[PDB]
Amino acid sequence: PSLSQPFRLATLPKIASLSNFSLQADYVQVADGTFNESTNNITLGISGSSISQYIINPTPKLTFDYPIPSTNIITACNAEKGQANKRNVEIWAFGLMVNKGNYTLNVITKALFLSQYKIKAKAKVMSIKIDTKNSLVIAILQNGLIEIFDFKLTLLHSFDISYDNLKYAKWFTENGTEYVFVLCPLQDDKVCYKLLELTSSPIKELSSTIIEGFSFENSKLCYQFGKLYKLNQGKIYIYSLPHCQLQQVIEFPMVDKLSPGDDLISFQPVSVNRVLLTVNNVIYLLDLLHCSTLSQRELTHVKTFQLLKSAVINSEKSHNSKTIAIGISTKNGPNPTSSLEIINIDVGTNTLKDSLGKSFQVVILKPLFDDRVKCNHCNEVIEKLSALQDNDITSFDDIFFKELKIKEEHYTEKDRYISDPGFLNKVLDLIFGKFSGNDYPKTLTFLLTHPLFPLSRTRNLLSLLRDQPRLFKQAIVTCPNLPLNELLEELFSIRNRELLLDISFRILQDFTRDSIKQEMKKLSKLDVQNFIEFITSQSTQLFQLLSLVLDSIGLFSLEGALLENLTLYIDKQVEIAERNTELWNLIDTLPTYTMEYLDI
Amino acid sequence: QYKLSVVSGGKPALNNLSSVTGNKNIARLSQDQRNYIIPFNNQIKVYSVETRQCVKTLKFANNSLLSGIFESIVKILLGDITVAHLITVFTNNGHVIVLNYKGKLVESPKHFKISLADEKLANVFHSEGNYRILTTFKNSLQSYRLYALTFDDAKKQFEVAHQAEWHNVILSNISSNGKLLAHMCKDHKSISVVSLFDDSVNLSFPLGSILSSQTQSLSYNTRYVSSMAIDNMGQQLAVGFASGVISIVSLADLQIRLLKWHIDSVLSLSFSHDGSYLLSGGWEKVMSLWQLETNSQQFLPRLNGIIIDCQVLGPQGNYYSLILQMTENNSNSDYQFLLLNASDLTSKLSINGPLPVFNSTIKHIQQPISAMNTKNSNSITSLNHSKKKQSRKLIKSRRQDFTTNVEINPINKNLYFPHISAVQIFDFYKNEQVNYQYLTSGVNNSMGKVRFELNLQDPIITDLKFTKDGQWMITYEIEYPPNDLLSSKDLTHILKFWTKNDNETNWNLKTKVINPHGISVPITKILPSPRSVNNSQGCLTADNNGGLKFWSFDSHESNWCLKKISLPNFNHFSNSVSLAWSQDGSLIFHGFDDKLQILDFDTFKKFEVSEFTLDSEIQTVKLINDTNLIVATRTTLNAINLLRGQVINSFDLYPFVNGVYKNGHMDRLITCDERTGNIALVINQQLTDVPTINYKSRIIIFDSDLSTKLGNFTHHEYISWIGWNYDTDFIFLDIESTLGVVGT
Amino acid sequence: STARPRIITTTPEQRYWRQYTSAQLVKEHNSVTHISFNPQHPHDFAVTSSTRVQIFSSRTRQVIKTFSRFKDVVYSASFRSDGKLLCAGDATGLVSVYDSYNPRTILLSINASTHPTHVTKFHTQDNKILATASDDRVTRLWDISNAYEPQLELTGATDYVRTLSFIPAAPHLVATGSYDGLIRLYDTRSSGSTPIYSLNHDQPVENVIAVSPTQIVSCGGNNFKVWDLTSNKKLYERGNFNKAVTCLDYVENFDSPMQSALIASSLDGHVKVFDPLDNFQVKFGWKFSGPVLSCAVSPSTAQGNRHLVAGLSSGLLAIRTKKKRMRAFERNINQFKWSEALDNAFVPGMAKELTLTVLQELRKRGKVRVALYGRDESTLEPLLNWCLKGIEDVRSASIVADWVAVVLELYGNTLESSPVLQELMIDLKTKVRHEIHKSKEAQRIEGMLQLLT
RNA sequence: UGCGAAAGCAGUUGAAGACAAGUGCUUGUCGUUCGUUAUAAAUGGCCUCG
Lengths: 600, 744, 453
Known about the structure:
The structure is cut from a larger assembly and holds chains A, B and C.
Chain A: E1 2-3, E2 7-11, H1 16-19, E3 28-30, E4 41-46, E5 50-55, E6 61-67, E7 72-84, E8 87-98, E9 102-111, E10 115-120, E11 125-131, E12 136-141, E13 145-150, E14 155-160, E15 168-174, E16 177-186, E17 190-198, E18 203-212, E19 220-224, E20 227-232, E21 235-240, E22 245-251, H2 253-256, E23 265-271, E24 274-279, E25 282-287, E26 292-298, E27 302-310, E28 322-331, E29 338-346, H3 352-355, H4 378-387, H5 393-403, H6 421-434, H7 442-448, H8 461-465, H9 469-478, H10 484-491, H11 497-510, H12 513-522, H13 525-536, H14 539-557, H15 560-588
Antiparallel strand pairs in A: 1-29, 2-29, 3-4, 4-5, 5-6, 7-8, 8-9, 9-10, 11-12, 12-13, 13-14, 15-16, 16-17, 17-18, 19-20, 20-21, 21-22, 23-24, 24-25, 25-26, 27-28, 28-29
Chain B: E1 3-6, E2 28-29, E3 35-39, E4 43-48, E5 53-59, H1 64-69, E6 73-78, E7 86-91, E8 95-100, E9 112-113, E10 120-126, E11 131-137, E12 142-152, E13 157-174, E14 180-185, E15 190-195, E16 202-206, H2 207-210, H3 213-217, H4 220-223, E17 225-230, E18 236-241, E19 246-250, E20 255-259, E21 266-271, E22 277-282, E23 287-291, E24 296-300, E25 307-313, E26 319-324, E27 336-341, E28 346-351, H5 382-395, E29 407-408, E30 415-419, E31 422-427, E32 432-438, E33 460-466, E34 472-479, E35 492-499, E36 508-514, E37 525-528, E38 538-542, E39 548-554, E40 559-566, E41 577-581, E42 587-592, E43 595-600, E44 605-606, E45 611-613, E46 618-622, E47 628-633, E48 636-641, E49 646-652, H6 665-669, E50 671-672, E51 677-685, E52 695-703, E53 709-715, E54 721-724, E55 730-734, E56 738-743
Antiparallel strand pairs in B: 1-56, 2-3, 3-4, 4-5, 6-7, 7-8, 8-9, 10-11, 11-12, 12-13, 13-14, 14-15, 15-16, 17-18, 18-19, 19-20, 21-22, 22-23, 23-24, 25-26, 26-27, 27-28, 29-30, 30-31, 31-32, 33-34, 34-35, 35-36, 37-38, 38-39, 39-40, 41-42, 42-43, 43-44, 43-45, 46-47, 47-48, 48-49, 50-51, 51-52, ...
Chain C: H1 12-18, E1 22-27, E2 32-37, E3 45-49, E4 52-56, E5 63-67, E6 85-88, E7 94-99, E8 102-111, E9 119-122, E10 129-133, E11 139-143, E12 152-154, E13 161-167, E14 170-178, E15 182-187, E16 197-200, E17 205-209, E18 215-220, E19 223-228, E20 233-238, E21 248-252, E22 260-265, E23 270-275, E24 281-287, E25 292-297, E26 306-312, E27 316-322, H2 328-334, H3 338-345, H4 352-364, H5 369-373, H6 377-390, H7 394-410, H8 412-417, H9 419-452
Antiparallel strand pairs in C: 1-27, 2-3, 3-4, 4-5, 6-7, 7-8, 9-10, 10-11, 11-12, 13-14, 14-15, 15-16, 17-18, 18-19, 19-20, 21-22, 22-23, 23-24, 25-26, 26-27
Helix pairs in contact in C: 2-3, 3-4, 6-9
The structure holds one RNA strand.
GO molecular function, one term (chain B): mRNA binding
Main location (chain B): nucleus
Keywords (chain B): Nucleus, Repeat, Ribonucleoprotein, Ribosome biogenesis, rRNA processing, Transcription, WD repeat
């Protein structure tokens, strides 16, 4: 999953209504019909400016514009292509608002103006759906009236939800049938949720419920695949249709730090259980199912970015993991300028593969039993060790072994309680500061044998122990997770025979053949050349290591004079080995007339 | 919430006394001869012979008296002595219980108690209203007393009176009529036969007289008697020898008659009612009818187990009762009771319990005597040393794994036991065996192994698993080369894919892979693939070298083909590897030695922290849910969130699990549900004042992340294995061959 | 009791084609030019040879109708879709139409041109129209009713046109391939006489076949290339052939594990099977004595034994057709006759594989030394003779080593007094030494292979 | 026998009692015990129902 750089579609006009950035998204409407995964067009209603249709690819361009008076506010806008009485046409339905005194519903038919119609709507047109199959325009009003008109804006049907001040309405299609769910605030943070099915009455009420504890004023609402997501006070509440029962709650810590009032938050669904959350100029692609931050991107060149709409992928049925989202970006500067910007989004495969280690959520051994059978204080010790004077080996070792009741200088299974990484790392830090030069405490020997030796101190560890052969030897044999590069450079640098053998075994034991080859190519031609000379002067692992060198050298780099010698050396080792084999397998494994002298 | 309850049965009960032979079988056929009564270690079952189904079941757990009393049954007698479906159970301690079949158990049976003074009841028998009881009293030879038992109505008590006494009884046998007793003593030895209810028969003679001279020159096996039998009339006595020679003696004049077919120690000898036929059985796996007028012989070979005991059971000899052993499983003594229709020698009724194969021997299981000491048998001298060694191993030694692999069928919920070279399909809902299928080559039923052939090892099924769909069976086998050969050290590793339809009951082999992953490399771990990937027809196989192979079933080939491979040629060998697959199937967790790797399935390679170092070797790696992964190392267990990559909880297993078990057994001891949570099982030795053979088990239910303990339950015996049934309940197998269940 | 377990002793597409085992070779009097299969049951196939056309019965695999009225060399025997008619071409240029299985009646005789007419094909979709191509380089489209003038006369070929194909689902489309190296497409709905467009093969076109409605496979020169008309370009090209590919045939929806097969003659004695689903890749092939000029297979709905037919310049016709108790040693082992079972293993005319099994069974049985106790030099040699040859084989190499050691450990002193057995060991020494020597390079070579990777 | 990988790495195979044979002495044995992690070989091979 990844988030691209936004690219500009258009620059918003400098209108007073659009000057208030916090409400700017409210003044820009995106048509649901024209904005989806497969459509290359976006129809956008900019309040006081126009309703404009743009093509996105290959380059953003304005294809159509319908001007609107500056004093009018676009509350709902939709555009859909279909066949009308038959000609291929595009139907645009929009609602405009003049000072709250009069409310206009407008329908325009264009040939792919064929017609234009305008009527007075009783209350705020909030959601508009176009049914090209039946040539119907369905308008939901804030007073709760759902009115079905024809393309000529002749009222065919009217339905009352019995609740006013409707605040959220969303259309969706399931199994080929059209549905709409509407939310109406009630007092004391109560909400009327009504689910309606579109089919004597074409509108059938399927569900009606009252939800308590549901505030709107600070609540951000979106819907996708039967799930309603509500972002409020840094918590995302996931409700499930058709009963809109609260299914889960996700705590999102990175919003909890936001001061209420200054931070501009926008939110959309982008795929199954995947959402996009923008805080000021920062953008997050989040997986709600696994509670992970799939992606993050900061727009340094803009003060804020607000989402308007996103083309949602049904990843369960779609092999496409790629979509787009549209929003408003507001720049930094004394004269801020707002522009429409589109972001290319890779949601991903919707697998647990994507979400690992990306959680947005931020030890002591516990007995098995609380309470006649055979049996087979970190901070305090850290402080005691730190209080010791510099270069006091005896006191350091005494305190460590006695306080931790350790009996052996090497790690044993009895020392499990000590395995907490935090305590060990501090002890390592103390030893380095406390002791320098040629004398180290026995505590290191214990720590080297420890399986949970921190990875952070692995680097240069062999370098530190070069001076003491024993400490160096102990590290190779037992100390875990030693970096391969240090082992290789140290292998070709050591002239001591014994350490060369142990290192090769440790390298070959803990690293795959493929891994070791690549580093060994980086090694200089001279060092490898020196190494080969040493072999000329358990051994099978070393010989196996030699075979590994030869490939890393490559047929080209090999030089004839040396190769003749090595050819001689191995040939002598051939007959020695073959001779040995025969010895080993070896160790596994009447006459008619006779003349004889009797004894008396 | 959860609760534990025993479900299945156990092994059939046997009269496990060394001296007693010819009478090991305690089960009794009804007087109407329509149903068979079999006492088990934990239950008594009544099977109608005609339908060959268990008509009635009587659990000691249900009855308070039986629960308190159960000590093992020494005998069953049809009807009631005190007084038409009554039976009397005599146990070793002396409790006499009058119980009823064909009906409902009465919660107040006529419990009684015979009074014995430091005597262990061995046998009881009757002819017409008269009852004698044989008892054991204490050179390593047990002595015996014959008492007279009668019930007095006035006191309602069983009064016991002394008749006879014998010392250092080596071997003993009772006539088919139940009226004559033949026994051997060291007073080397002497055989004496005595009438029980009368003084008519009283004879004795040294073993030397019947014993021949050439055998005297030969080894002790020829002089060693393995079985004896007495005719009802007492005129004939058959003695079997370890060498496999049978010898009939005429008691009137001590005339000897040799019948020699068995090549190994004859284990069971029994005379027919008239005395014209002699039944013999031994290691040959073949029952022989010796026709004595002509010394002809007929053979019923091919039987499942060697013949421990054999009898003629009927007023007219209509049926034969046989006892089979299945010596292949050295860990446990696997007894199977066969009732054959004498007319046609066909199985009228086969009875057995679950047949798990434990990793090591348990309690006091000893291999049967054979001519020579082998892996599957003990020589004459080897018996005492082996018994002492077994006891001292159970006491002093610390490796006490006694863990068995068991598998559960998703489609049928049948229980699969990987027997040696074979699989038992056992239905725990009905507590009856449904099938026994041989899944390997080898000398498995081709014959009865004898003498050095008994040293041969048949292929061993190490790992058995099903696919999630359940229509496929993956099996991993190890074939051991014969000894005394150049290629005597190159074990062969085999993998087999099997199928069957739901209606069909026998798996048919679909593909065979010889030497997977190369030569001499064991398949230490196998994991069927989840439903998401290849709709449950894939699998993963993992070695001790860290190599992984992903196989899938290809429709085009119609066969199983190697889709992916990762062969990092590591040089260190460790049998401690664990494998887990995420439910979505995207990723695989592979714990090898002390380090865990997260490998992406698509690339089948490490993720791009993939590496998790642990304190010690991983025994088990499992994910209770997609979020959390539970990893068990030999010193502790740790719950990690993959989401944040940190340990939630850590529990120290060292005090209980240090070296008691070999690596890999924590996999089968640790079980997980896919909905509610997982379970940890720990078995400990109970010792009062040096360790004792009896054990105690504790099962603990843990939630996902191991935050809390849902429940903690205690069982009185070693729970060999525990697994998660596909229902919420978990099934657990106990070394008593007892399958209980823990569930809501 | 239980019955006795009985002693237990490539690609699916390849295995299917292997089932055409029955091979019959027939000789014709001149080069066999064209081979056709009747679309209708019994799907009898026609061969064009010399001055005659012969119809062969599928089941009998023998000539049933002989058409000898043709005067000069015959160049075609194509049937109509119904199969009730068959059309043919002659060097004189006259094209004759006969009733199939009725040689005598000349139903329609048309003189296409003075030049030879090499290709005559009934239109698959439409029966009444018959297309004729000639050395005049005009591919006239004739009608059964109109025998005096062609319905249409396609032109534009500057060289010999010897290939004519009708595209399924596109009856109007006609494909022509000339020795120009150009494949020309025509629409009969239009006025015609001019190609819709030309496809360049760059080499003389010997046969053009429409594999599918949108895909057309053209075999010309040393390679065959598949062209899609929608893209108007060659999707794929295979040039494994060495001689110039001559004839090409395609079958679909037949019972093989492969859905569709493409058989291509090479003229180098090879006809090879290509699978369209896997990008027309080589899956099978056969070799013949000489150049292959014609190849054919039974149509999809054969309803009987399938037939593969190959035509050679020598006149040879090859037909490959796909037609639609316990042993002694087993007794010895079951009867525990260990020594005799080993004797049965080394008997004249005994399969090597079976010989291994009995030896494997005895070893698995734990009966090895026992089988060899009662033996001398006379009865030991047969085992040794087998051991001398078995050592070469990889599968037996481990087994022979096992057996040889036991007899060696068991018959030391006997070997001393027996000179014949000694020589058997000496040659046994040499061969194992060679087997050592052969193995020794193998470790050298395998390591060498490792260097490159 | 312990550990481990399958390769292998270490460590064991003692004492008493009784019996038999041969000549108090010698040898061999143990349905005898205590302690340690701790060749075989009585001529003797698998049913029938097509």
